[PDB]
Amino acid sequence: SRRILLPKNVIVECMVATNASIWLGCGHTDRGQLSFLDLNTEGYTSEEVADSRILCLALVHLPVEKESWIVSGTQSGTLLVINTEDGKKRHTLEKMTDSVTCLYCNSFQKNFLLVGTADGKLAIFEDKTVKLKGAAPLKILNIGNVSTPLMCLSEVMWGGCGTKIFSFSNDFTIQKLIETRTSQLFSYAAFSDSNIITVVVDTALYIAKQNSPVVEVWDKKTEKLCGLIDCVHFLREMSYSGRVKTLCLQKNTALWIGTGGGHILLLDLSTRRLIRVIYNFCNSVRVMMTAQNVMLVLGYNREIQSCLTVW
Amino acid sequence: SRRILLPKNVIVECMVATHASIWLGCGHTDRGQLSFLDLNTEGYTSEEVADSRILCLALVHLPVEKESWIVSGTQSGTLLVINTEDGKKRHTLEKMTDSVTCLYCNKNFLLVGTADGKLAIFEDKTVKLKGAAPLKILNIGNVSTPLMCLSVMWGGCGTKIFSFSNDFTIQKLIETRTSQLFSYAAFSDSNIITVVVDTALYIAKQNSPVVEVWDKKTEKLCGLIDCVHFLREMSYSGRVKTLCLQALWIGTGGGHILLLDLSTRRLIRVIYNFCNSVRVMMTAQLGSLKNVMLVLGYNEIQSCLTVWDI
Ligand SMILES: [Pt+2]
Ligand SMILES: [Pt+2]
Ligand SMILES: [Pt+2]
Ligand SMILES: [Pt+2]
Ligand SMILES: [Pt+2]
Ligand SMILES: [Pt+2]
């Protein structure tokens, strides 16, 4: 477990991993800047590639044809595809009607690129179609509206749009649609009336909402509230906000929770709750993900100093 | 609303009002000290009446025979009955096997809940008799589950809510630990300290900032009220110390008082720093057509009694 310091004032909007290295979208700029970090040598290189800020990233790998493409979704709705080996090979897919707020690589075996936009729409591209300039999506699901950004996808596929949890399968039709804005058992009502920022899929659905310290647990079948995890009370065992910023699952039982501060919780999901707690791991946990085995945690301190801890 | 400052370092464990004046059990002493406060003149008098700390008070009024008796249940299990008019008229009922942790006035009856999970029932008249035995003793819990609140009659014993109407059968028995699935586990695994009954059961647990709301019929959780989150709209503990219906009043471990709506579970009023710690909050009848709200808090200790009209 070592910490790699990014250059000063670098802000990381988004992250994808692949001498291990990671691709980063820069948030300290209004244009689209793509950065590359060698996890071994801690070397950092960047390049302005788009006109608007890069919101999320995805890595589409084609085993046949032996080619890896890095896909950047931008604030203007542009999907910029760049070749990993030869940067001179780059093109653009079909422009989205709003900003690209989610990029996911799914498999059904057929591979797909799911693209969630800020106007509540979900575009689906096929694995091969990513290579084609101006390529059109196979389908576009109108799940929400301009006020309900589609911000997270997890794997059947579950996703978060506004205050709704949606599900879809092979045929790409929305099967389950669960409204999480209202529940009588809510410990506090104002927290639940916020957009869902992350969804992790296990036996139940564990969701977190913007500026909310309460991780909600909903059932797939009954579509009702299974439970509540109040990070404020777990942290107090005192002025912590407990605002959840990221959720990450370990192999089967453990769930990682990054809070608005630099606190990281590790909870068991079978019969008890609390396993491990690390206070002041940073000033603010921003991203937390698993890569191939390996845990990556991107935080920032504030001038701004972004750091990437890995173990 | 007016405040009455009690003498310095006076600690009030229990409280009961009569017509205006109030009776207090003292908690700043290891013996059983009973105090009397005139709400008009703010005069304070006290007397050591028992060997162990007076834990709970009750006021048994007999309209026929025209007699008021003050009953004190203590840490040793003694039930001391004293005449309101003549202090020399005092006696002791049957000793309880553990400390008396609840006294309620409900034909009229006196319910006596003890720390070993038992509930003894006395009739209205039998309080006058020296060494009188209870009509019945219900063994609801054990030595580890104290019966600490009563409000058909509902009550709290350990982590269970019990119900009874005609004094010889425990009707409902609901386990409230089951709420571990919602908003915290350690808070739900605590003894019930207060229960208020309007349409659902609003219960609070020791060292818990979460008021649970349970259904009478389905015997399941209706809702949760997290005082920490309501207070933050920052280091407040939010530990609930008292509940009282009017709307629902909630006194917290701090000096904060919440006033919430029942039908909507919305926030009506919030009074920050009403004192340093709210301890007791109740309604009293200080005379004919006189409904009054009493709040006992404390702030090196200075206990204060705020009083206003409803
Ligand atoms: Pt991302
Ligand atoms: Pt996500
Ligand atoms: Pt993850
Ligand atoms: Pt009492
Ligand atoms: Pt009570
Ligand atoms: Pt009350």
Swiss-Prot record, chain B:
Consequence the record notes for mutating S235A: Decreases WD domain homodimerization
WD repeats: 2-38, 43-83, 88-123, 128-165, 171-215, 234-261, 266-309
Domain notes: The seven-bladed WD repeat region is critical for synaptic vesicle trafficking and mediates interaction with multiple vesicle-associated presynaptic proteins. It also mediates homodimerization and regulates kinase activity. The COR domain mediates homodimerization; it also mediates homotetramerization via interaction with the protein kinase domain.
Related illness: Parkinson disease 8: A slowly progressive neurodegenerative disorder characterized by bradykinesia, rigidity, resting tremor, postural instability, neuronal loss in the substantia nigra, and the presence of neurofibrillary MAPT (tau)-positive and Lewy bodies in some patients.
Protein name as it appears in the record: Leucine-rich repeat serine/threonine-protein kinase 2
Assembly description: Homodimer. Homotetramer; when activated by GTP-bound RAB29. Interacts with PRKN, PRDX3, and TPCN2. Interacts with VPS35. Interacts (via N-terminus) with RAB29; this interaction is direct and stimulates kinase activity. Interacts (via ROC domain) with SEC16A. Interacts with APP; interaction promotes phosphorylation of 'Thr-743' of APP. Interacts with MAPT. Interacts with RAB8A, RAB10, and RAB12. Interacts (via N-terminus) with RAB32.
Reported effect, Y184A: Decreases WD domain homodimerization. No effect on kinase activity
Cellular compartments annotated: Cytoplasmic vesicle; Perikaryon; Golgi apparatus membrane; Cell projection, Axon
Highest taxon of the lineage: Eukaryota
Span within the parent record: 2142 to 2498 of 2527
Species this chain originates from: Homo sapiens
Effect of H229D: Increases kinase activity
Tissue expr: Expressed in pyramidal neurons in all cortical laminae of the visual cortex, in neurons of the substantia nigra pars compacta and caudate putamen (at protein level). Expressed in neutrophils (at protein level). Expressed in the brain. Expressed throughout the adult brain, but at a lower level than in heart and liver. Also expressed in placenta, lung, skeletal muscle, kidney and pancreas. In the brain, expressed in the cerebellum, cerebral cortex, medulla, spinal cord occipital pole, frontal lobe, temporal lobe and putamen. Expression is particularly high in brain dopaminoceptive areas.
